[PDB]
Amino acid sequence: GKPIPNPLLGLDST
């Protein structure tokens, strides 16, 4: 699909 904002920016991972 068309590009969208990267939703993982600013999030911590575990």
Partner: nanobody
Framework: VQLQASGGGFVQPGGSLRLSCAAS????????MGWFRQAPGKEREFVSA????????YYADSVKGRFTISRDNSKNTVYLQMNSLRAEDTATYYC??????????????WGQGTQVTVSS
Amino acid sequence: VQLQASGGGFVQPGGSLRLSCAASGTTSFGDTMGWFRQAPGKEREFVSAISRQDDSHYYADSVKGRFTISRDNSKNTVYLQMNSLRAEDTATYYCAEWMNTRREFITPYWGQGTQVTVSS
């Protein structure tokens, strides 16, 4: 893009649901799988993602601690368990697979949604 979400339905507040996101197994779009949700009249909201570099799990602040994302692998499926649901979690839930860019934008490859309605 065959990425069907299932597991939706009617649930009472406090209940749980386990959603399923069945990937191709033939084609990978492909290092990250995330769950998004969309409610009538609201903006699309990112929920959770699982990304392979070693399995990394991401959660939106609004579902952190209540939701769990996981993968079966043997069945090419990503699960989203949603616990202690509330009226504001009502929405269509759907998956996308993408390559984590670590940049401003991603290119999502979208699956079809399943409906979750939290009501009395």
